[PDB]
């Protein structure tokens, strides 16, 4: 009756739709069964992980082994998503993003493989997305104009004026420009290049700016015909859907149209060095130090065995985590607390992306004079690890951490599985051996029980005696990017001089046809699609029970199949907290479980956390009310996880954190604050649109102001200011004040998620813990410019709308997603050239516009104004409304993990009745309701606007007096 039982019914040797069952293994620790199939005619390998989880995932992988630095697989992956023969419309990927019930749809290109995963919950939608992906990847129209627009071409700055000089344009070309500007990408790539100089790892697989114009259309088509062939493919699917439908679809749509080829693409082993080497490279300056110039990164890297031999790789990965993870690691105590640098080097720890894995350690942010000092420190630490070894508790903490990662229930499990086996599988390894994790743990425990100094011989063998050592240093030079610009401009002029006038008219005509291709809106009615009748009308009700306990704390127990885990959450309000101490709350949450408690130092505290729990964290959350725009609850979410047996120890740890935290251990706190300030400064580009919307939305509601205080740019700038203070002690005195105002039971509620079989013991442990512990805003417009040293812009525009429970909210949500799908995508992305841009409506009632890597500023806001004029014009059909409803119901019905079912009632206090009411309000949205709501809220002068800009200097913005400059 179940799916996994029938998946265990697959017998060896059965022929199923051209596939042959080669191997069947039950993985009881993961509640999934691995099955290995091979297609007889093509030789494509198939691995299916059948597990009773409705979020089904498919992925297909192609082995791309480049032999030059042209970047052909990255551009080929970009171009293959631009159109196919059966679906000639442009970009099936984004078009199916609004015609499906998927939760994830993307693609990745590593150094030596390309990966196309998606996940969805509807079997007909699975058929839909699998058919579009098969036809897009295996049968694209390989039009020459797609290769000139996305890749490389010579083009005038204005394509209609034939007298201006020629320059390079292209998506991948400027992606590699932006990759080359990234110092970490130079460091990682050159590290791989110098350590592996023999074969494909010695080149820039994403594309070398000096080697990119050597790529021809003929080479692109030949590479596609040779490498995007199903014999060079590995298909992977995960979940509970019947396999027969998948196999039948694969055979009837794709595999029959090809014939067998044999890829001559196996990567040979890197030849071992006889002697260690040193290299010096250069990168681009940053704003850290001029005269001192501490922006010097150094690393020491060691070659490790292959990922094929699974056991030795698993052992060395655990060893690298013992060496680098946490303040109890040798390298942390030797390097981080040495005060010579700022953070670990990039690619620190075990890096298994290449064929031969490699270990790396070092620091960034050091003075260049200390390079030999660092190298001697690394050698001396290897000597000390050989002489002293590891304590048994840290080994137990690591084995408990890896086991807790095995049993944990996430919502994106299949994506983690395909990313975890892609690298090993790419080099012809057996992916099933990475799945049999229990056996590796058992053999690990036995191999430690037989030889107590085994790991000392491992560290000696692979670190002190490893002759394939590389010490690589980087120092910045003032004359670097102009040298690169000189040589690139020289390649440009040498390529331009040999061109005839007939070639220039060919460029002129190709440019005008490319502009027409980029301008004309095309039709996508050839794609198959679902309808609103396929969306479930009602959701299954989630059962809860709230128990007031000891003597007024409400405690929510949710019986769920959590697989032997207890997930504890607590939310304590901050309404009594003084307003001056508000901005230091996130810092408190980030350091509370890292400073020591009672008789435990920070080393022992971190050891106890890794030994008993799977991680204990605190993060501030602002939960808006659903019936008043000017009502919100502010508080801190304490979250933890443990196995069922370590629960009383976990609650003993929690009681010790709540009753005697050590806010006096100052040195590790200084280390952590400089590390988090560095981490937040490093993370600005990837979440720039989030920071732009959050600053843009500060001025509409008090909840926005509190979100600005907890997670806006003010928090990063303040954290940097605190990290620049030389005396941290008066800042450290503020933490007992947060302990005294927040750690009590006056305004508290808690949650427990566990198995029902475990529930009474959890109720006992929690009641013991609870008995053991102590006891009118008017929005106003704001325009803001953050001067950032970025090459692209990030702008945000916010409009104030209705909250969740208003019937107009569902219609506004449909309208926002509609505008994103049918206006903003074409206007900002295709015309403008930005990587991301759209419209969103948040749960509190903020209609927010955003831009991600946008080259323009004024034209983007003008496109926003034309989008609102488009919405008032009403120029959309009922099928577009069905498409927007499909996308919204694809978003709200995203799968929730057992650890958060139901979390939404615990946080926001929305019952299933409110969700059913809003779901039927999304059902009732009509065309005239969309025009009415567009003239009621989005129109000009009806609500207050807010503006914010992240980006470089722009003089035209600076001469506007209505902007405030930051």
mmCIF file with all atom_site columns, C-alpha atoms in Angstrom, residues 144 213 328 367 453 529 687 703 783 897 954 956:
data_model
loop_
_atom_site.group_PDB
_atom_site.id
_atom_site.type_symbol
_atom_site.label_atom_id
_atom_site.label_alt_id
_atom_site.label_comp_id
_atom_site.label_asym_id
_atom_site.label_entity_id
_atom_site.label_seq_id
_atom_site.pdbx_PDB_ins_code
_atom_site.Cartn_x
_atom_site.Cartn_y
_atom_site.Cartn_z
_atom_site.occupancy
_atom_site.B_iso_or_equiv
_atom_site.pdbx_formal_charge
_atom_site.auth_seq_id
_atom_site.auth_comp_id
_atom_site.auth_asym_id
_atom_site.auth_atom_id
_atom_site.pdbx_PDB_model_num
ATOM 1  C CA . UNK A 1 144 ? 23.554 31.623 -33.968 1.00 0.00 ? 144 UNK A CA 1
ATOM 2  C CA . UNK A 1 213 ? 36.629 35.287 -27.933 1.00 0.00 ? 213 UNK A CA 1
ATOM 3  C CA . UNK A 1 328 ? 37.987 23.783 20.336  1.00 0.00 ? 328 UNK A CA 1
ATOM 4  C CA . UNK A 1 367 ? 50.367 41.672 7.067   1.00 0.00 ? 367 UNK A CA 1
ATOM 5  C CA . UNK A 1 453 ? 46.665 7.026  17.793  1.00 0.00 ? 453 UNK A CA 1
ATOM 6  C CA . UNK A 1 529 ? 0.161  23.836 -18.313 1.00 0.00 ? 529 UNK A CA 1
ATOM 7  C CA . UNK A 1 687 ? 21.229 39.885 -0.107  1.00 0.00 ? 687 UNK A CA 1
ATOM 8  C CA . UNK A 1 703 ? 7.247  46.724 12.446  1.00 0.00 ? 703 UNK A CA 1
ATOM 9  C CA . UNK A 1 783 ? 14.450 58.679 -0.271  1.00 0.00 ? 783 UNK A CA 1
ATOM 10 C CA . UNK A 1 897 ? 9.173  20.356 7.385   1.00 0.00 ? 897 UNK A CA 1
ATOM 11 C CA . UNK A 1 954 ? 25.692 58.498 -9.849  1.00 0.00 ? 954 UNK A CA 1
ATOM 12 C CA . UNK A 1 956 ? 22.216 62.572 -11.652 1.00 0.00 ? 956 UNK A CA 1
#
